[model samples]
Target: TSRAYENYLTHWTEWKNNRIQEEQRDIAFQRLVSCLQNQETNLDLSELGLTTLPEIPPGIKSINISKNNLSLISPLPASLTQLNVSYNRLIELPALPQGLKLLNASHNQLITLPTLPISLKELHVSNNQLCSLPVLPELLETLDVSCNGLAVLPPLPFSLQEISAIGNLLSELPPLPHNIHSIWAIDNMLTDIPYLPENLRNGYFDINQISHIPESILNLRNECSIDISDNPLSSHALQSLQRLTSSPDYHGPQIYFSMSDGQQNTLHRPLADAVTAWFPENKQSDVSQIWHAFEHEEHANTFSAFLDRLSDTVSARNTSGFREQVAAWLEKLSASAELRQQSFAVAADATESCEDRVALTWNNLRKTLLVHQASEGLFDNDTGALLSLGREMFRLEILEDIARDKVRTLHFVDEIEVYLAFQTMLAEKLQLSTAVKEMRFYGVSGVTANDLRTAEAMVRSREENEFTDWFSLWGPWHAVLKRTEADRWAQAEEQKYEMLENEYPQRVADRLKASGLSGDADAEREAGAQVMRETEQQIYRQLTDEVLALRLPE
Candidate 1:
């Protein structure tokens, strides 16, 4: 009998407390009625510690019930033109007032939105659980759906002037209308952006996978602000930035490169401070100044200033346990499924030249190891052997020429020997300055075979379709334009660009001719997209999955 009493009290306590909360809130509800009776143009019921909203009276044109605990909003009046229900627990919204033009319902639990009123212009539904959204009002101007799980957006209306879709998984965007101006697409998986409009003034594309900037972006209204930092920019892209930064013809947008945010150096902050300072939000960079400074004779001149201390620095070299590290790296790499697929994927294609096959394999492995060697994690203690291994990698540059030799046909056809050579050299060097904890490589270290296949599928999906607009393939589609360093990739790049400069002009001409003749711009855009789609996936296979293209050589 006593145990039964304990169970009853547990249920009774919650039930008893809820009733008290209701009666306490009922007093506030009466105050709501008292305010509505006067037929005020706006009603302020914000931050009142209320749990539920009473029915709103008619003739009220606007309402502010933000920062409340209301899970369900009461029916709104038809006369309402604006509403703010932000900072609530609403799972969904009631029918919106017909005349409503602005709604700020941010910070809620809505998974979807009700059909919006036609009169609505500005809408803010940020920081919600929305997977998708309903058809936007035709007159909608500004939309903020940030911090949601949306992978795709509805067709934007012509009246839309600005949009913020930060923090989503979108790989690409839909077509924008002529009236569109501003976009915030930060922190997405976008590899390339779509055709931009001329009216675009403010754009944020930071922290994405963009390879290069499109020349067409030059068409953006002058003095725009375009953010392209924190991406792996290509050489041509970097060159384009230099031109855009200091051009005499037109003052282009201020492009932000992560390099100029500070004056960083190998020396301490105090030592670095005396070097030089950059202007705030600098439009240019100090990389050339820093690069030439390395061989500037200042640091090297100071080195011999203390000759015997240099020997002390030399004595600090500790090249132990690197042999085991090298072996372990080989052990982990040979076992990696992604590496095997990438190695064999090229091997599966018998059509490639003997030199290319060998070159591709070395590139695959070397780039992986190089990414591991971000070099920041390394110290002066391991610098000696690490530099030695760097020399070995440099020596292997001869392998491509070796593949093209007449004697090569007399020996083995595939130079799997180069991969083995790296392993041998790596083993030798580690014993000489020490470099690893489990030998994590770039793109391939922990990647599985399924991941490789899925990545291929993703690339195919991303590029297989004919595009809707002309997009730059970093610096034009590869053809044979591979990610390579100069030692071996020299001839391939010229051969690839020789064809690129030839074909790209034709693609541009085809699209421009149509546009010049008053053809549908979208149709002309699709014509250009068709050309890009043909040239993208070949290089993407190297970057998207464990089997990325050979990285640009260090």
Candidate 2:
């Protein structure tokens, strides 16, 4: 077959399939609507919980399908006129009936409106996202496009009587229609008043930026009532205002009526206008910066509350450091408008992010612990000095015990025997850890190393007691926690080496015996004293390295 013939066949098959699917969908929808149809002239399909709508049946005149969850719909009936589909989730509306007269599509999330019907007289499309409107129908009498994003409006119809464009971004309006009577343009960006028709009776331009009253407005009938609150009127405009206000025939529209009713008209800006600005993006490293930031800008009210519960909740330590890292991230949300309305959700996100820094601080510290696990100056200055002094005192006691025949040998094969020696050393005055001055450190308030081991045992007793509810909240305890834990492990490895110093010498002598080098007692003693075998040293090094663990990986 030719390539063109094959393409034609493929396109024909797709068209045939689409035509069949449309027929089924349309027929199924018409049957559902027929079952729900209750009136000849009116079709009330409101509150049907619809997510989608099907084509309307022919001959329907008026439709009321308001208050549904609709976002999509098929075409409307061509013969229909009036329609009301308010309070729906519609992003766009279906085609309007050409002969339609009225439409009330208010409270939907409409970005823009559909085509207007020529016969339409009344249109209500408030509370939408529309930025602009189409040309008004020539016969329209009333129009409302309030609370939208429109910056400009199309020309008004000659037959239009009333218009409401409240709460929009309109900086100016098109000329009013000749027959227009009432106009409400409140809460807009209007800096100048629009032309008022001669027959205009009521005009409300409150909460706008209007500064001048046009001369044409005063030419209206005496029944005209106009209000222009929250604007700065010049001396010339004030004269025009007084002339009408003081006129004998004028009965309403007081210039200072807003102030008399206890209504607000402030020259000052509102609360959020200046105070709710953003914090600096780069974080403050020094915790003191936070105190100064609030003391300088505000009382730092909400900022303090977040940190207060942070430490109090977790029994954490070094909160002075933790909050600096936390503030850097938590301040990201400080400038938002709804911080008051949704504080906890924001707090939860800040708390979750704080948890990351806790573990990060520990990971960096843990790497250092692995590197200097057994160095001479492994711990802090005071801790290193204290441990060295304890080892020297222990050495002197062991030497005296050997001289007095209290301890025959400095080596032990069994850990049980080694522990017994420790028990005696602890109980005796010869153990000069007792003579040392008092000292306090993280997780321990002790004068001796044994006190730390005792506290570790007490941790188990508390574990039996279980955790307090406060610990459920996140904290920065890992910084001090991992340090103290490493101290305990390091002290254990040191004890094993000190108790069995002769064990390595014993192994060297045995290895020399197996080789049968110079079989004489004095010669063997001399050889053992000078011996430094590589294989024996390798085994000893491997054995020592296993005493403590490195919990963090590289």
Candidate 3:
């Protein structure tokens, strides 16, 4: 309501800055109300020295009082359509009257947003330190909010309009609804493009830091006009955009002359074309050209000749034959499963003396490897011999370790030869290691046809309490000594052995006396004598089982 002129004047009696107090405020408000009554349904009172609003008359639709010194606003009439309270010192808003359509309160010191009227259509609250948007009316439409610290966009009203927002510190935007038409979210810290509804008439996302367009947003090409230039989208993205532009919804022709437009076309191809082209074809693509660069045909021929020589050497190496050997061993092992069971039992004995058993197995395996040697005897390649494919390619260090008591089971391939002595030897060593207690070697070597008969005899006609026993001789007492080291001593042993030949009692005495006299004894300790009784049986079992039962897989 406008105030009428009073009869008495308080300023004339007071006389303190009367020009400022009397002329400025009263004249300004009168002029303001007069201007609002004339052409303007809305009045702008921004940057004014207003301490408070008096009252608004009826039928006023819009008012813009931003950037002012007012701490409060008077209750507006019910006919108001717009209210702008931006850049003010207001700590809170007055209880709003209804029928308002637009409110802009940006760049203010407000800690919280005002409660909006139900009939609102547009709201803009940008460039403030606002952390959250207030609960707005359902009938609201447009929002212009950018250049603020918005972590998430609050759900806006369904009927929205043009937005002029840019230069925010946003990383990713929340889901945009399908009803929104215009978005101007440029120069933001966004890493991904925001989703736009599929049926938009105008869309603008030209100055964002987006790496790729979201697939859901791409579905809007027919109903929407898009602008996504000035982003970090790749060549592949451009190609994808071109394909989308050429889709059936496109307004222009799909096919035309290639050189007509200043563009490169790459459509109607697989989705992975960019990735495939990144690595492209192999070196063989230009093999003929590369070969042509050689000084002469002789160079090409030389390479081919070298490859041929390598191929021949590869064939001669008989690697497949070794594999077949492993296979045959596996087959034979499966056939004599029952016999192999007995070997497994001894090796699986946890209570057995591990150190002694390991030594025995290693010594027995050394003899087994040398059994088929061409009679060079102790001087043969035997267990210690290393073969050559290449030093780096093939190794026998694992087998040597077993022989020298350095390791139990070397995980290398050459460790198989240590177990190759007999089926039982591997099982015993495995038990000794305790590392591979569960690992049962399924295939062992096979017994030959003639050895099958011997194996059958060995299996069946045994004593009732017997379980396939054999002994190995460790000391030199049983053998005829060679005359190479001590010619006279050898001669004497030969004479004594011959005299006691075929006489078991006499042979035992002669062996004991010969060993004792020469200080090279066989069974001096009680423990050593006890081992000799079973040594022969143990040796035989180890030898027979390794050659027959210790087979391998194909």
Candidate 4:
């Protein structure tokens, strides 16, 4: 009976304590309700040291219980659209009111969040112990989850316009919403950033380990801004910025970058510095100096040296677009016919020849004439002048006693051989160097292959009665002095004959056909054969006169 009395006393004591606590809550609830103004709609229960919340009054639309010691909040009035329970010791939040549009639970001890109401738009959960967040409400536009221990964040809702997730352990940011205009993810462990939305106007990713930024970011413009300070960006990142600023499409936007200790790199500084250094800037390069250095050797600086000066010492501030300027100058150099002619002249003296004096004069004349041909795209008729000069040097000539009828034939073809040797030598020098080839010349008119064949027959007829031991008598001339050296004359003569007889004729025919001015088949073939004979006769006259002019011993 004594043990039963103790149990009854214990129950009575708990009941009395519960009743006293209930009466206290009722009094506090009444006080809060009385404080509501404007027809019992708005409630401000802030700065109260109450450990628990009172029953929410009906028709309450806004509540401010900020700076309180409330640990657990019960479900509020359905009509509540705005709530601020910030700067509190709330370990857990009650189910958010369905109509709540804005909630600020910042500076709290919250470890987790309840299901956010769809009507919520702006939420501030900064300065919390949150490791992660629940699915954000669809209507949410602005969010601040800064100063937390979040490892990763949920996919942002489509309606989000701005987000700040600074001071976290986030390795990467989730895909940005299409309409998001601003992002501040400072002081995180972020190694990379996702593709930013086009509408992004402000981005701050400072104090991270990001080494590269997407090249597409150069397109951002129109008061848009980016700050990627305190990261180890590579030199290629700087080069991309330089290229963007140098591009024709670049427009303005403020940008910033830096090392961890806020020092600028020598090559790649902040984006602001890059813009100032590169964008749409232009400078005057002294092209006259470049050209003068090219034409005159008297100038101390060469063209290459001038280019190096422009590249190395020219001010980045004054010498923008310098490479474009240099390119224009180089174009001018390449187009100058005079320059090509002069360089070709220098290229001609490289050939070695036995006739030093005549070869020297011939080389100089050949340089000028070939340059003309190369520039004009046709053969020069002045080639005959060189033939005359070449004959005077070798000291040999045709015999005056030979019959005019016998002009087509001769006992000693030494004059023919010597003259042809000189022609062949000059042509070879041209082929080996930058000189013109005889095959690339204009045609002489009014002769046929039959005429050339008749002349060749006359020469062949004379060969049957020619002296067998004539080479013994031909010892005085240079062509006969060195038998081994003279051995190539036949091949050289054959090469020249082939060009005139076959190649030149075919070439003219090809040109006539290409120009659509062809004659009848027989006439065209006769014309080709005729041109071959004319060139052959001209070459024969040139060789005959040149060899006859040479002063050889009887």
Candidate 5:
């Protein structure tokens, strides 16, 4: 087809070019024409600024003249099956031959499809200015006219299966033909959905301006699954969609109330049925008859007030037998809002007093010891007794030992062994702790690290002690305890007396702080200092007298 290449290149160079450039384009035309009828060769000289067709190789049937400034195709090759002349400056084109099947001329300045081949199946001519489509052949199936200036769905090919017309200028969907099965029409400008066929399957119409579906179309029960997500619709619209999915034939539920005008109103049939279930049975028919006659929003309001009162009886958390009473009265409707009441179930109060609980704990320990003693001989071998009672017994034993003979001074260096023994006895006990709270040791030297370790090891063995009525230092009821009441009162009285004695210390300090008697020598000679000096002498004499008496005149 020399007519094809010659006509095409002739028109290409006619507008503007030197003779040599025209000659170059002529060479291109010759090369492309030679390969036009060939079926097995390839050509790759795509954009050489030759605004003309290229000579085809002997075995080539496809041609690509992409990224060129070809304004128009004067003649098209009949034998070519696939042609890509994209990124071109074309305005129009005569009809394609029946042999050409696939064509891609994207990013072109085309106004219309002046021609198309009957054998064409896939055609991509995006980024064009065509508002309407040319008649397509029945053999054409896939078409891409996206990024175009089209306003509506133009007539499609009889055999068109899929089309991508996205990024277009369409306000409303011009009706699509049923033969076109699937369409991906996202990011569109739509206020409401136009009526679609019931058989329209698998649509992803998200991110649109549509609100409620048309009332007329909504009335028609369609069972097709639709994803109309990300629409700013009302709750009613969501209910409509759910209803479309679950029960298309269902009528809407009703809302009910009684009015101040001595008439009742029911909003809808389903709501009337709900009122029958919620309200008293005798009241149901009467209210329904009244609502059927009168149409007032206030009747529903009055009935809602009654329902609120009925529901209040079951709402509260800790009701005094209110739950049980309502549960029994309503029977199976125990969980119903109307039967539930507003009351708190009273929590357990502290019936046992603190002193009683402490006494009970002591008794429980004694009982535990008795039980262990009674059951001890039953063991095959001599397993120890008093394991659980060790801590309490140790405390009693220490008190007895100290009271038997008075030891005025306890040197911590010497008494460290005693602390270790105390810890051992404490560890044998089940319930008592080894924390010393307020007891003071007199004339006690510092204890060693090894002494502390021994004490700690003994304390850790307390876990094996069998005991009763144990308590935690961080007990939840600690705030309610008055265990330190005597200490608290004693401290208060002592603080009062101590305040009275504060003047004596101040008087002595004042003498010491005087101008001439400030330093160490002056402090020794002051009047209050002399009194303290005499007191110290008297204490020394008294100590000597006590020691002499204890020595039996030695």
Candidate 6:
């Protein structure tokens, strides 16, 4: 029983087939070796007329099989470092040799490529029918895949420095490597350029639909020259280019403009003049003027004056007392009817719906309110109450208009009330005044309990000069304002949705009834439902547009 052979037939047959295949490869290897010269270092086997490639010689570092009729190639040896199989009728390629650094397989009928080698640094697979490419190796520095049907590209390698993919069907280019210095991508369907590397010195993005050269490219004008002619450029873009060209900072090569006929066109001199005329002073700065104002000495002095007032009234029994004082002052000012009338006009003018006008009136006033509000609550950890106070102020403004139309004398009282309410609101919101808890509250006449030790206390509260009073309103406080505004908008939006849902159905019914459709009961209901759905969608979209249009100041 032990001597009997167990299932030997299948195993022996498979072994025999493998042995025969190995023998055929050995014979092919011998023939390929015979064609090589220079002791297996360089093999020149061009114009061989072979329909299929034989086994490649193992030790050869360079091999040329150009101008051949070869249709297929199997895997080459790992020892092969360079290969050129250009001008061939090859339809398929083999797995690349691991040691290979350079490859030229141009002028082939290849529809696809094999997995590339990691050691490959240069590749040229032009004039093929390639619709896509495999992952390029990290070491690849130069690539030319021109005249292909590629609509997309694989992730680029970091070492890639130069690329040419002209005359392809590519609608977009892949993210280029940081080392990329040259790009030749003309006559394609490119809509825009990706971020060009700082090393990029030359670019050709002609014959495309690109309209604007990015600000990043403008910054690269130190040595880079980009040819972006033969495409539709916007007037603003052209003007920007003219401005950049005329700038003292621009010393690089000229940017050319081309006609539809591909002739070089001279940029009209008026274009530069027209662009400069808009900026008569001929000065441009990237910095923000409002931010400069925030850091100005005037702003600092105003803030210091406010802090001085805070010291005087820090522990004033309550904000109601402070507000009463403002009310008394407002009454005296109100008896002067002409002054009251002018103030009313100012309020009406400031209530208009323009950005600059509203911002100019409210910017400093709101900052003052915020400082008082934050200090009064003394950091309550929530700004909900403060937001309510702000909304009330807005309501007060609206009431002033209503009261004025009813009776001019009644309107002045409401106007004084609004100012009084502002004082109370500001007093209750100041947090810095809470620091007065560290001071001794001896029986000072004007200074109440919980108040600091006079104006000197305000001076002693700071340790650094850079610290501004505006900082009290910024950071977490600023976020609170944004969040509160967003919350307010959301609440308003919810109410709007409910109103629209209620009113839209009747509007749709009216429209349908006006259409004069005399039909079955069920049919009329179905038609009404459809019309209502469409109308609701339209209203929702319109509401969205309106809401987005309302951008409150920062």
User: Which candidate tops TM-score?
Assistant: 1
Q: In candidate 5, what are the lDDT values of residues 395-460, reduced to their tens digit?
A: 433332332222123211111223323333333432443322222221112223454354444444
TM-score of 3: 0.39
Q: Model-by-model lDDT, in order?
A: 0.52, 0.50, 0.44, 0.52, 0.44, 0.52
Q: If scored against the real structure, what TM-score would every candidate get?
A: 0.45, 0.40, 0.39, 0.43, 0.35, 0.42
Please state every model's RMSD to the true fold in angstroms: 22.0, 32.1, 26.8, 26.2, 30.4, 29.0
Model 1, position 11: C-alpha lDDT score: 44
Candidate 6 per-residue C-alpha lDDT over 216-328 given as tens digits, one digit per residue, 9 for 90 to 100: 56446455678888775533245435555676765345556544322221222121111111111123232234224334422233233222222222212223333222323
lDDT of 2 by residue, 92-141 (tens): 77777788888888887877776688898889987888886887788899
Task: Report model 6's TM-score to 2 decimal places.
Answer: 0.42
Clash counts per candidate, in order, are: 4, 0, 18, 6, 38, 14
Off by over 4 Å in 3: 1-24, 32-61, 66-79, 86-92, 106-111, 162-164, 221-224, 242-554
Q: What are the runs in model 5 whose C-alpha is more than 4 Å off?
A: 1-44, 47-49, 54-60, 174-179, 191-235, 239-554
For TM-score, candidate 2 versus 6, the one ahead is: 6
Name the lDDT value of residue 331 in candidate 3.
29
Candidate 5 TM-score to native? 0.35
Clashing pairs in model 4?
395-550, 395-551, 396-550, 396-551, 397-548, 398-548
Off by over 4 Å in 6: 1-38, 246-253, 259-554
Off by over 4 Å in 1: 1-31, 259-554
What tens-digit string does per-residue lDDT give for candidate 1 at 196-217? 7878887788755664454456
On lDDT, the stronger of 2 and 3 is 2
